[PDB]
Structures are given as C-alpha cells and as structure tokens.
Symmetry: C3
Subunit: 583 residues, 3 copies
DNA sequence: TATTCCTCCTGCC
RNA sequence: AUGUAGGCAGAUUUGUUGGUUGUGAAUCGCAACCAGUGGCCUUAAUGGCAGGAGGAA
DNA sequence: TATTCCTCCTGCC
RNA sequence: AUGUAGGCAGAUUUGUUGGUUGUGAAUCGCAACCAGUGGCCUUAAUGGCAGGAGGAA
DNA sequence: TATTCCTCCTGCC
RNA sequence: AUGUAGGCAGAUUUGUUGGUUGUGAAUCGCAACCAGUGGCCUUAAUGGCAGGAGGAA
C-alpha cells in the first residue's frame, strides 16, 4: 500500500478473499464475474485493417472484466515498481508498456548507431498462454504466490488460454514474463557488441560495427537471415519471429526505431513533419484541411487532431532541446538581444511551424473571441465574474449535450512558459506591446484569411498600458483624432480584429485597475488575519491569495455588479466585428 | 518579327527571293555571293598551334559571305528560340553556342558529382556535311522548308561538303543538328543514373556513384574504355570520339567541366587565379607585367588584358555569391559595427585581389588624372563643360587612332554598385571621407611605387565636405592651422597624389556648389510648368532631369565659363605633381 | 667562446696538449684521469626497473671523468653546430639529444599522418664500440682529427667497447655517428613517400597512404613485419632492431610519437592530462595529493611536482597556440563585452586547469603570505627594504637549507605576461580591482578549503586604489560604515584571507606613494646629472635598478617599517581568525 | 533503328 | 533578270536514395551541407504506456 | 538448458 | 456463502575502442562531435636535450 | 657496397 | 715530464596529389582544414556564346 508493501500484501494473500480485498472489489462480485459468467464469455472481437490482405484482431473485455483487469494492472505495475526497487536495478531493456518509458527513450538507446537490426515477434500476446502466466506467478521469486491467488490472476487475465490484446492487464504480464527474454538477449547482445532494446514485440539490436556480427544476422542475397544463436535464444524463450518484418538498415537509409529516425539524433519522420506542415498550410489557406477517415474518404479534420500531431512533433523537439542544453558550451558574440520577430531565431523550422499554428489557433482561426489579460490573476477574476452573471450574458456561453454543463464561450488566453517560448507572451506589458507591434505581420502571414472572431485585450487603466497607448497614438491612428478619448472609452479598435478594453475609471476619473471592480465588502476580507494588499505593492496577502481564496471562494458570496460593464463591452465588440464582415 | 513568327516567314518562303527578303538582303547580292563567285572561292585558311606541335585549321569566310552567314545565324537563332517557345521546352543539355548559356551553367550542372567523364568529338564541324544540313532543313518537322530555300541555306552555310569552323552560322546549325544526339544521350544517361551535358564538342557525363556505370565507361588497366552502348550512341548519330581525350576523374583529383572546377563548387582553376594574382603583383611592383606572345618572347601586356582575367574570375565569383544569397542560412551575427577596412571582410581572397587591382587602376597606376566627384550628376556637368571648352584646354585631351577624335584625358570616376562592393564608394560624402581616411594605407599597400598622375577630388565648397575638411585639420594637418582659409584657394594638396578641388566661392564669399557655376539665365528653363529644383530637397524635376535636359542637350550652347576655374585647378594640380615627382 | 673557431682548433690540434688546452684542463690532470686511473674503473653502475621482467642498466662516470666528458660534450656540440653552419644545411631528421630540438618538434613532423610506424633500436649506446667512435673521428670529413686526438677522445668517451649510457658525451657522439643512418633512412623514406624522424633510438616513419608501403612494413597474422629493404638499411648501418617494440598504428588508435598524441594535432596524452587534473583536484579538496614512489608506496608530493606536470602540458599548449596564431582567421564579432570572468573564454580546458592551479598556488594554498602590488618596481622596493631590515623582522624570514641561507618568507607576487594570460593580473590597478571582485568566487571554487595564510595587497594612499576604495565602500562593506577613514588604518580586512595595506598617510594628509616613503636624500640622488622623476629625467626603472638595488650607499628605509608591522598584524589577525 | 477528476487529440505496439 | 548540289530526329528537355538544416500558395516541392547507388515492414483500439489541448472542483 | 650562477620539479630517450 | 486450471527466470539491468572539445567532490567519470571493431611497448637516471617554479651577485 | 552604335580585353569550343 | 688500443659516410637535410579557405616582394610559395597514393587532354580565331573596360548618340 502507498507504494510501499503492495507486493507483500499480494504474497501474504492465501485465498480469493485476500485477493478481492487487495483489488478492492467484493468477493461475490469478483467470483461472479470470473466464474459465474466465465471470463471466456465476456470478450468482443474487432478488427484493425492491415494492408497485407488480412487484418489485426483485437479481443476486448466487455465492461466489468475490464474493470477487474484494470485493477490487476494497477496492482502488478506497483508490484513491478517495488521489485525494481528491491533488486536495486532499473529498466534499461523494456520500453513498450512501461511506466516512465516512451518511444523516445527507446529510440535514444540506439541513437547514431552504424547498423540497426529490427525484429518483430509473431503473435506476441498469443504466445503468453495460461500455463505460462500461472507458472510465472507460482514459480518466479518475488511473487511465489499461493496456488489459489496465482490461478485466479491467470484466469482473470487469459481469454482462450492466452493473453488477449485488449485486456488492460495483458501489457504488464507480458513485460513480467518477457523480462526473461530481455535478460537473455541483453547478455547475447553484450557478448557480440550490440545495444539491445524491446518495445512490446519490437526488438532493436544496433551496433557501431560496419558489419553486423555473423552470429546475430547476415545479409544474404535472399535478404536478412538471422543467426542461429539469436533465433534459438528467441525461440527458447517461447516466442516466434515474424520473418517478413526483419530489417537490417545501414546509415545510408532511414534508420527507424519505433517510428523515429536515429541516423544522427532522435527525430520525427521527415515525411510526417512535412505532412503536418502542409496540413497547417492548408488550414491557414482555405479554411480547413482534409484527412481520410476510414476508407480514403476525405473529411475535414479538427483543430484538435492537428494540435495533437504538432504536440507529437514537439515532444521530440523538446527532448532534443533539453539534451542540447546539457552540452551547450558558452560562446562569444552578441546580437540585438531579441527584437520584433527576433524571438523566433532560437526556434527550429518545426518549432516555427508549431508557433505559427498556435498563433493561428488563438488569434486568427479562433472560433470564439480570445481574451488576453495582463497577468496570472485577471483570468480567474474574469471567469468568476462571467460565471456569476451567466444569465446576464447568455450569448457568452455554449451548450453541452443536454446536461446543464454550459461553458464559457471564450478563449481566456493563459500565458505560461510555453506561450513565452513559442509566442513570446509571458503576460508582461512589454510582451503585449510587442504583440500589438507584430500583429500586422502575423495577420498578413495567413494568406489573406479573415478571422471570424475578434481578439480582445482586456487590461487595466494607466497601470500597465502606457507605452502601448503611446504606440497606439503615434503609429496606428485608427481614428481621426484620439489622444485621451480612447483612454476613457467603452473599447478600442486597433487593427483588423484586435480590440482593447480598458478597465472603466471611477466617477471621479481615477485610474482604477481590475481589482477595483469588486465591491468594498470583499477587498477588505482578511485571510489568516492578513490584510489584502491593495494590488501587489506590499502581514499582507497579494493578488494570488486574493484570487485563490476570495474570488474563487464561492461561499464568500461575491457580487460581480461592477464587472457587467466589461462583459457588455465584449458583447458589443462581437457585433461590431460582424458588421465589419458585412461591410 | 515579333520574335515569334520569323520561323513562320522562313516556312512560308518558297524561292530565293523570299529567303533574301527574310535575310533583308538584295537578291542580286545574295545570288552573286553564292553562285557567280563560288562560295568555296571566298574562304581563307589559318592555323592555331597545338601542344603536340599540332595544327588546328580554321576556314574563315571573306566579308561578303560572312555578312550573309551572320544574317543566317541571326535568323536561325531566332528560329531556335521560337521552336523552344512553341514546344514548351527549355534548353537543359546544350551550352556551347547557345544564347543565355555559358561555361558556368555547364559546370554548374555537374557541380559536386562523385565521378566526371569527359568526352570530346573528333572533327566536330567536319561531320556536319552538306547532306546533313540540307536534309535537316528539309525533314525536321519544325522547319520542313521548301527544297530551294533549304538548298540555298545549306549552300551558303557549307564549305566543300562540311561546315567551316569560322562561319558565323556553323554554331547554330551545329546545335540544331546535334539536338538529336543530345536527346539520345540524355535518355542513355537517365537510364544509367548520370547527368549529361554538352558544350560544342565537349560532352560531360557525371554521376554520384562511387563506380561509374559499366555500360558507360570502365577503367581498364590501359585507361578509360567507353562502354559499347555509349560509343554506339555517339557513332550512330554521325560523330566520332577523339579517343585520346577521354577522361574519367574522381573527386581525389581536379574535376573540370569546360575550364571550371566542379569538385565542391563551380570555381576557377586555382593555377589561373594564382597567376592573375602574381601578374597584378608584378604590375604593382615594377609598373608592368610580362606575358608570352605568339613568337614566344615576353611582352608587357596592357591593363586591359589584365582586368579581363579579373573579370573572368569575377564572373564565377558573382555567380557563387548569388547562389549563396539564395540559400544564405540566416542566423545571428554581429559585424562589430563595421570600421575602416571593414568592407573587405565580406570579400574572399579572389575578390580582395580584384578590389586591390581596381583601386590600383583608378588611384595608383593611372595613365591620366582621376577625378572623383560625389553623386552621379557632377561628372555629367564636368564632361559637358570639358567638351565645351576643348579649345581652351588642349592639354586636358588626348588624340584617337588615325584622323581626329580628341577625348577627355581624365578618368572621370563613376560610382555604382560594383564600386561600392569592391572599393566602398557608393557616391556619398561619408564614403568619400572614409576614402580619404584609408588613402594612406592604400598608398602604402602598393610596395612603395609612386603614382605617375594625380587623383583630384572635385567637391562643392563646404556644403558637403564640411566634415571632411575637419578631418583634414584634425588628423592630417595638411595646412598650417587652416580652418576656413583653405576654402579660398583654387586647389588643395591633401597628401601623396591626392588633391582636393573645392568650388570657387561666390563674389561675396558665400557657400556655393558647382551647380551654381551655371549662368542664372539657364537656371530656370522650366518645362511643362515644373521648376528645376536646384538642390532637389525643397512635382519638381530633380537634379537628374535638369542635368540630362539642360546640360547634355545641345542647341542651347550653354556658356561654360564658370567651370574654367575647375580646369585651371586641374592644370595647376598636374603641374604641382610633375614638379613634386621631379624632386 | 668562438664556437666557429673550436672546430678549426680541434681539427688542427696534433698533441694531447692542444686537446687539453681546447678543453681548458691541465694536460697532467687529463692524462692522469684517462690513463693512470683506468677509465673503466671510474664508472658507477645502477639499474632502473622495467615494467616487464627486465631492467635498464646505466653506467655513469664517477665525478671527474664526468667533468672531462662534459667538456668533450660541449666541444662536440659546438663542432656539430659549426658543421651544420658551414654546410648550409639544417637538422630535420634528428631531434634526439640535439640542441634546439624537442619531442614536440619530433611529433609535429608526423602530425596528421594516416599511418605511423614506430621502431626502437636495441641496445642503442651498446652498438657504438670504441673502434667505431675512433674511426668516425678519424675518417670523417669536417673533423679529420690527428690520430692522437681522436684516440684520446674515444678513450675518454668509451667504456669497455661501448659508449656509456650515463656519459655526458655519449649523446652527441651517437648523434654524429647516427647521421649516416639518418641520411640513408631519409632517402629511403622519401623513395616510398614517408616522413622519417629519429629521437635517440626511437625511429618514426609516417605516411598519409592508407596502406603502408610493402617495402617498409607489412601487417601479417603474426603482426607487424618490417620489409627487407628497411631492415637491411638499418642493420648495414650497424644497429639492431628491438622487434618486440615495433608498432604500426592507424588513425583509429592513439598515434604516439615520442610520448605525444599525433592523430590530429600535437597533443599531450589524454590520460596524463586527466591524471594531472585529478591530482590538482585532490590537492584542492584535501590538503595534498598522493603519488607512488620508487618503492611502490604513495607519498604526499609537493607543489613542485604538480607544477612541473602542468608546465609540461602547458609547453604543448603554448606550441599549439603559436601555430593557431600563425594560421588565424580574421573576423568581427563581440567577445562577451569583456565583463568579469570573460578572460577565461580564451583558455581551453587544460589552460583553465593550469590557471586554477596557479591561482591556488598564489592565493589559496600558499604556505606564506602573498604580497600583491600595482607595478614592477613596488616589489623591488619591498624586497630591498626587507633585505635591509633582516635583523629587525626575523619573523618574515625562513631558513632554506639552514646554512645561513635565510630568505624572505614572504611570497612577493610577481606579475608578467603569464599571470595576465592565466590570472588576468598584469599589474594594472583595474586588474587588482577585478581581482578583488572575483576573490569571493575564486575562494569558493576550492571545495570549502580554508587558506592557511593571508593575502595582502600593498598599495599607496588613495593615489591609484581610489577605485578599490570606492568598491569597498559601495560593496562588500567589511566595516559597518566608513567615508574616508579607510585611507588611514594599519590594515583592512576585505574577505576571508584578503587584506589591503595602504602606505602610512602623511601627517598633514597629503597622499603618499612608495617613493614618498624613501628619505628625502635618497630621492634626491642623481646619476649622470639627472633628477629622479616623481612618476633630463629618470623613471622608476632606473631609480630601482641603480638606487634601491645598489647597496653601495647603505641607503636607509625609514617609512618602510610601518608596512612590515602592518603585515605582522595581518598575520596575527588571520591566525586568530583561523583559531576562532 | 495547488491537486484531484473528467472530455477530446497525437504517437508506438 | 537569274544563276548545281550529298544523311536527320529512332521527334524534343533539368538522373537518383537517405539524413540534417532552411524555406515555399505546400496533404507535397525546392535549396544547401553530409553520406551514398544493399534490402525492406508500413490504412495501430474500444487496451497499455508516453504525451498534448481544454474544462470543473 | 638585465646576464651570470644556485636549488627544485616535469617530459622524452 | 462461493466456484476450475496446462511452461519460466537457465534468477535480474545501460555493448565497446581511439581522437578532439567541454565539464565534473574526480589519481578517474560523464556528454557532444569525428572515426571505428587490427595489433601493440609501457616503473626512463645520477646522463643529454626540451621546458617549468623560484633564490641570489 | 536615352537605349543605339563604336573600340579594346577575358574565357570556353 | 709523461703516461695504449677493435669498421661507418656509400659525404649531407623538411616525401607527395587534389579541393576549399587564408595569406605572402609572388608569373609562384606558404599555412589551415577536407579527401587521397588511378588515369589523363592541354599554344582555342579573324567565328559563336557568355562576360568585362570605356567613348559618343
């Protein structure tokens, strides 16, 4: 329990009652799912098409066997972690279905190697039969389970005397039983001077030798023929080889480990990144991009899918950056210390494409108005205020599938390290000034596309926006005469779709920030006997604690009367932009 | 004819009358040249020696036949261009005698290939016999000329059976009839993974394989043996292979395509550039260099023989610069804010030698005074004046070849993009001040040789050189504690051979420019109601329009008398420098 | 004396008296040493252990034959230099025991080569028998010595039918007699396209070819086998080949020429440099490092040993730096806008380690206080003052060998180009300000080690150190509060072990320097009728060289005790701080 | 011739 | 007023792979640099693992 | 299954 | 109130050489890049040469 | 042992 | 005063190719880096093509 003695609890168990307690399910429910309704009668088969005529068949547990198997998976994952701790070892050979392991680390193991050999195991899960699972639980030290517990686990895991593909616990059991082959193959590889790794049923054996060892594989004119020692090592561990998938790749072609290039660095497939580039280009250009859904029929993809692809590329990009940092050797020379558009000089071409896509997502292809604020707390204030006045502004909300789960119809931009890296927007005022400065070129970079929604920058009055106001006056000149009239106006219209909303002044014309919009009954509340500092100048608590324990604290019953103004402005802006699209 | 239907006119031609009309020559003259006087009785043979005591014989036509053949060459070149346009193809395989093609593009085709194969065709022009020329004009589907026109073209184009080397129309006919072999060899090369190109009779076949294809050529233990397929392709097209000139070159030796190195980039032969470097060095030291003549005895060789070699090298340098600009790999950089002598860091060694030579030509090895004037209109005024007062100043003129053509004996320096690139003289005041700054080092860089002529810097009085003069009194000390008195003498001697000449001051000593020298009668002469803005800084015609119209145009007979001061100063400077040299 | 005439004098000599006069010894002593007392009886014999089962035996002259052979060695070295000069040639195939030649140049001859062949000659000196030396001295042009002189030289230079390993003259004689094989092998190597060099008995033949010429050496299953041509060219020159030492090295292994890596540049062995790095690290962490001795037991080892190791590495570093300077590549680019710690951007890793060691030597692990100054003559003034006041301050002195060799215990820091390169201390005041700025980080860099001695910056009064005083007021703030009283103290405590000592301020308050501390009469001294410039004039250099340095006048140091008592007060203060 | 939980997307197997 | 004539098209236009980087009206091209002319799997969930984008408390 | 000594240390052979 | 069972550890975790550069609580590791999967010697003085750190006249 | 001509020079074939 | 002798000169000094870059009292050399130890053509107009240097209109 608590990542300390789950394995001890499992070993101590002597009956299905103990096992049911460990899994945290009733004994009646467990033995009803497993035995009353035989586990062999709770699997549905589906198919994944394969280009090689046939298809890949997946057996999946129905509803409740799946829950029991997920519990077994959690138990066995914790047990494996504890075994690793006890034996004082680390996972260096298995990457497939392992916690803390990814395809990136598996590829990194073989980065830059002269020759790479790829083997695939035939019918990986069908090879783990019921006898093998039960025998592993009975015989392998560190488990040595009592017969009843081991048999119950084996029956809850297996379908037709083998591990099904779609069972949640099959991955971990496969890892546990394939550790034997892992160690044998690691010994063999180290013997013949090769790096070895596995990812599910995908074995990679690389070497820096110019010729692969003859005991591992030879390149006959017929093709790649695995050596007898390696083949017998794999077959003596109870697995077969898919002879039609054995590859031997030299440095002069693309060396791929589990989908990633390893010729020089761990990289994405160039074809994949270029296709993501082209899909983003198509989205910017017309209004969308098309992908095949099931049978080659081109259907429009969503922003979610393209963002997921870009994030997949960015995972490898970020890994490479983190690795490059540890090697960076300081150098001489200087530059402009970044300028307008000078923050993209540090970015890749892939990272430049991702930056452009993120900017599009937030400011050019946004499907709802995007609100930019000037800090980490204005977002919480705006969200709370809009939630309180939901009925006052119905048009600022969307509707879910008839469950009263209404959501805010806005993109409240959240600035963090990632938007600082890609967009150059960490929430500072200088950052917003540079944002406005570059807005023209950023807008132009999207192939004449016209955003359908406005981008509203809601920020304080006279507190932060002074240089920005000077820039607006001296450069934009969106109005015939504007010096301080827009310093006190319902809103502003800077550029194509960019608007700015300043916090309304007091009746006396005072310069009031966003927090002044709360009633006086709330600004004076003391948390732990600490006076709420006015905004942040200062025994006192800053705006962070104010937002966390006052504004978001719904029990305090904060009335957002003097917030309606701001929301009203946004509403009007929406209509205004529509008129622009109608003119 | 619109650059599209000259081929149409040739097709429509049906008699010698139509051909003569197309050529724009009287029919009687054409028939006289071709028939009354045998075309074979209008040729002269001369020789070019060959390394192996050999002879390259050239048959060249006389003037009357050469004019007709030049007209035919122009006609057929237009026809070839129109055929290329019509078939919607480009010229990618032929470079020898082609418009818009050079050896640079020929070499660029093979810029970095692993193996080059060079073949040369024996007796290239003696294989285009009369039958081939006449038949090509008869049968090619783009010509299908009437038999009489084709016969007359082949008669004019041909010496006794075959094309003569020296005929103007032989090259274009060679290209037209060698396109057949070009296509055949292009197909053959594409089959065996090789780039193919031709330049006259110089065939290059390059490949990136480490072994040249066995069917194209092999390296036997006797030399290069051409594959039977390639030999048969060349011979079936009616050409012979000069077996003594077949070469196969690896990247370990110099790979040459029509005179240029193609190992990594398209470059000049290193020996040639080094020899040009040495020739310029000899010129700087002793005032002359020596190159062999026809008889074998060394002779001086002028500044135009050199400076043609420099231009030949600069052609390749400029081509490479353009390509680098195309790629340019933009990234961070800091040039250290530039400096004196900092403009030469962007130049490679070859361009540095060229820039040094240009500076020697214009400021250290002049055969006559060099006049440097800021801008681009002052030299126009100076040339017009010096032409107007030719009688007044005979010593400022030199005679031409035979009867009489007197010309300004002064290098009126012209500033342009090339001068800014190589010398850092774009025609501004700042560049002129930097020129004066560097003059001492530039003078010292020429191995102690003393210029034989002055360098006169003609400038307006204090309007632009306000800063320059400060330098002359802050670092140079050219005058004894002079600040504003120096703006009152007809000439100034900065140092060495560098003199300055400011515009004479007005009667009241007011600041003035050389433009004010023009009489005020012709000052306005406004045309179309637009006044001529003298300073072009107050739709008023600028300084260029005024210069062209008023100054360059005759029929006004401008009274050039205010410019007599500048020429008097030039005479005084010449006398001063002559006296100084005699010291 | 007249190296060119020595060759003529030797080849003109005809009697043992002439040879003795050339060697500058009395004929009686020479002939008594060489003949009366057997030359074979004046040789001690000692062994050096070998890694294998063998041992290297060395026979060395006792003490007097050693002197005779030293004179002969100098004579023959001058003769060889003259023979090089007259022949209008230079040495290119031998680096060995040759003047002006080193292992660095020997390795540089073979720098980027594809394959390196290393041969070692067996029993090098044992192959130069007496007959061979005499025959060379007799029948070789450019010497053509009289048989008496040649026989005397051979008798002096030879053990029983051999050249002693420990004889001060065996090196040069071996070089002269191996020149024949040098030319033969140089021509042979040029024939087959190879660089050839010899260093004593270490022959290196290198080629840029990917296959070594079959006539020179070939790789068979047995190993490396030298070709017949090369083996005969060596054997017919009267030398043997140590076959077990023959090596052929491709670029995929460490290519070593006389101890140095050759693969890409001339470099130190990486294992050696890393070992020195680790030894310095152990010295910084603990109080000392350890190294094995002859008997196989670890011992402390002094700063001298580690300093020598670092200097050996720095020799190659400096050679590479000079070559890189020669090649160079002009360009424009900012260099970190100078700033602090930027001077280490020009140093590579080895040079950074050496710089750290030098800084530790002079400021952290110093065994005596280190005096820093702002100029070259300040330290001379302090040294003269301490030498004159030896009896007054025995506490600032130590016995080197106790043989009345008492010497200044104060480690008076001296500045030069090397300290500017490795420490950024050229003596300028701004450099001292930067030094005080960096002192904190430099102190922290030695793994919490506590210095055992102070470090005193002796400067003048508010003349140049004004920047230092401003920095101390606006930063550090050792004292709670000060405006200008810092200029008037016995000493100032700045950091852990760093102190500043200003001169005794004038009673009226006028700023003073080292010169003002001298008596008025001493400052007024004039040489060649020239007054001494405060800062027809004399600079500080002449003042120091002729006035302070020269004890002819028994010059008096009056305003020099005060700084000495200040130094002793600093010593006591730091001792108390350590004992705190 | 700040640390949970709950939707959706990507990728590998 | 003119003034002989011998063979053109196997009918027509930028060889190619990979990797790294940059860039482009881009579901893929182009340019540079490095290495080349072996072979080869390739519509991966509803599950595991590693991530990504949001929303609530 | 600055030009002479003296002491010490390093490295190669 | 619950409910069959047929094979695991040949018992357990980061293959390796050289060069260059950087770096590290370090008598040796680690990372980057380059080239790879041949062989091999190593206790180097009291002598010579090449240097380094100082002290004195 | 202005966009037209004219002169000269370089290079390739 | 003196204080024995056994063979060297095959008689003399920086192996070399190409590319790229830099540089030099230079018709060529030198240095760095990259790749090596195959072969080999070379006096190119008065013609064509591609350029360069100038002058007039």
């Amino acid at each position: 329990m608590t990542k300390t003695s789950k394995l001890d609890a499992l070993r101590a168990a002597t009956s299905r009652e103990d096992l049911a307690k460990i899994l945290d399910v009733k004994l009646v429910f467990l033995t009803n799912v497993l035995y009353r309704i035989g586990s062999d009668n709770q699997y549905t088969q589906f198919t994944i098409p394969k280009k090689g005529k046939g298809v890949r068949t997946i057996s999946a547990p129905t509803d409740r066997l799946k829950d029991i198997q997920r519990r077994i998976c959690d138990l066995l994952s914790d047990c494996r972690d504890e075994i690793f701790a006890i034996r004082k070892i680390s996972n260096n050979y298995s990457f497939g279905f392992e916690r803390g392991k990814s395809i990136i680390l598996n590829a990194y193991k073989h980065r830059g190697k002269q020759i790479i050999l790829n083997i695939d195991l035939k019918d990986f899960f069908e090879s783990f039969n019921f006898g093998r699972v039960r025998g592993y639980f009975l015989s392998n030290q560190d488990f040595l389970l009592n017969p009843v517990v081991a048999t119950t686990l084996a029956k809850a895991a297996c379908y037709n005397g083998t591990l099904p593909q779609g069972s949640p616990c099959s991955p971990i059991i496969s890892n546990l039983i394939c550790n034997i082959m892992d160690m044998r193959l690691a010994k063999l590889a180290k013997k013949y001077g090769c790096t070895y790794s596995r990812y599910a049923d995908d074995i990679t054996i690389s070497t820096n030798k110019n010729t692969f060892p003859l005991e591992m594989a030879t390149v006959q004119p017929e093709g790649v023929v695995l050596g007898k020692v390696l083949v017998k090592e794999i077959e003596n561990s109870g697995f077969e080889i898919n002879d039609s998938k054995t590859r031997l790749t030299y440095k002069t072609s693309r060396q791929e480990v589990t989908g990633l290039t390893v010729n020089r660095i761990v990289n994405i497939d160039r074809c994949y990144y270029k296709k993501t580039r082209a899909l983003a280009h198509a989205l910017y250009r017309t209004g969308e991009y098309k992908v095949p859904d099931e049978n080659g029929v081109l259907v429009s993809g969503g922003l979610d899918k393209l963002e997921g692809m870009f994030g997949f590329i960015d995972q490898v990009d970020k890994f490479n950056n983190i690795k490059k940092k540890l090697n960076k050797q300081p150098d001489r020379y200087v530059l402009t210390n970044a300028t307008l558009h000078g923050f993209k000089l540090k970015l890749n071409a892939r990272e430049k494409a991702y930056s452009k896509f993120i900017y599009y997502k937030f400011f050019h292809g946004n499907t709802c108005p995007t609100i930019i604020t000037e800090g980490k707390t204005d977002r919480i204030y705006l969200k709370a205020a809009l939630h309180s006045l939901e009925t006052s502004y119905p048009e600022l909300f969307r509707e879910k599938t008839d469950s009263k789960k209404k959501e805010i119809n806005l993109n409240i931009f959240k600035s963090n390290e990632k938007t600082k890296y890609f967009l150059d927007l960490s929430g500072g005022t200088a950052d917003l000034k540079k944002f406005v400065e570059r807005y023209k070129n950023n807008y132009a970079s999207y192939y004449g596309s016209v955003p359908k929604q406005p981008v509203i920058m809601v920020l304080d009055n006279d507190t932060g926006p002074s240089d920005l106001l000077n820039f607006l006056r001296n450069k934009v000149k969106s109005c015939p005469d504007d010096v301080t009239e827009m310093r006190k106006m319902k809103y502003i219209h800077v550029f194509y779709n960019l608007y700015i909303v300043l916090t309304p002044l007091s009746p006396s014309g005072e310069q009031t920030s966003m927090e002044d919009l709360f009633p006086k009954d709330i600004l004076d509340i003391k948390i732990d006997g600490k006076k709420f500092n006015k905004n942040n100048d200062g025994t006192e608590y800053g705006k962070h604690i104010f937002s966390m324990r006052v504004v978001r604290d719904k029990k305090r019953k904060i009335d957002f009367k003097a917030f309606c103004c701001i929301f009203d402005a946004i509403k009007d802006i929406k209509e205004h932009y529509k008129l622009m699209l109608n003119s």
